[PDB]
């Protein structure tokens, strides 16, 4: 359960390729969601 944050964001780290922690940073900031968190990585700076 609570461990989902680590694995869940990693799924993202797989999508955004971020770092367990980098994603967790904006992974959670956006609700550890992949749709939004992703738009950030891409819209993070051209």
From Swiss-Prot:
Changing residue 41 to A: Reduces ubiquitin binding and Golgi reassembly. It is found in: Nucleus; Golgi apparatus, Golgi stack; Chromosome; Cytoplasm, Cytoskeleton, Microtubule organizing center, Centrosome. Highly expressed in heart, brain, spleen, lung, liver, muscle, kidney and testis. Phosphorylated during mitosis. Phosphorylation inhibits interaction with Golgi membranes and is required for the fragmentation of the Golgi stacks during mitosis. Disulfide bonds: none annotated. Part of a ternary complex containing STX5A, NSFL1C and VCP. NSFL1C forms a homotrimer that binds to one end of a VCP homohexamer. The complex binds to membranes enriched in phosphatidylethanolamine-containing lipids and promotes Golgi membrane fusion. Interaction with VCIP135 leads to dissociation of the complex via ATP hydrolysis by VCP. Binds ubiquitin and mono-ubiquitinated proteins via its N-terminal UBA-like domain when bound to VCP. Reduces the ATPase activity of VCP. Necessary for the fragmentation of Golgi stacks during mitosis and for VCP-mediated reassembly of Golgi stacks after mitosis. May play a role in VCP-mediated formation of transitional endoplasmic reticulum (tER). Inhibits the activity of CTSL (in vitro). Together with UBXN2B/p37, regulates the centrosomal levels of kinase AURKA/Aurora A during mitotic progression by promoting AURKA removal from centrosomes in prophase. Also, regulates spindle orientation during mitosis. Belongs to the NSFL1C family. This is NSFL1 cofactor p47. It comes from Rattus norvegicus (Rat).
